[PDB]
Amino acid sequence: AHPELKSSVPQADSAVAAPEKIQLNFSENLTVKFSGAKLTMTGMKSHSPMPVAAKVAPGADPKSMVIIPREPLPAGTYRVDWRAVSSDTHPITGNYTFTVK
């Protein structure tokens, strides 16, 4: 069972106020430790993408992974790149973007 992205907070293509908490919810169970995610600032409110210092861990809910930034996110557009894998599959990947007001 491939863990596809079911939803996220902030949602893809949403514009949100002061996040500090990014949660990815998947369709199937995933092994977090073999999965991963990255947060990149792609358009600070054209420039090279800037990697964001953040921790990645299993979220409280089954099928979830959280990205916890080290500090507040400046306003601008961000891209989340994720890789999810289950004990019986090889990694699948995805990406989406959201905006911080």
Place of tokens 């995805």: 94
65 among annotated binding-site residues: no
CA angle 12, 16, 21 (to 5 degrees): 80
User: How is the beta sheet containing 64-69 ordered, strand by strand?
Assistant: 5-9, 22-26, 64-69, 54-58
90 among annotated binding-site residues: yes
CATH code at position 58:
2.60.40.1220
Residues in Cβ contact with 5 at an 8 Å cutoff, skipping those fewer than 6 apart? 24, 25, 26, 27, 82, 84, 94, 96
Q: 34: domain range?
A: 1-101
Structurally, how many domains does the chain consist of? 1
Residues 45 and 61: their CA atoms lie apart, in Å, by: 32
101 among annotated binding-site residues: no
Residues in Cβ contact with 47 at an 8 Å cutoff, skipping those fewer than 6 apart? none
Residue 80's beta-bridge partner residues? 39, 96
6 among annotated binding-site residues: no
Q: What is the resolution of this structure in A?
A: 1.5
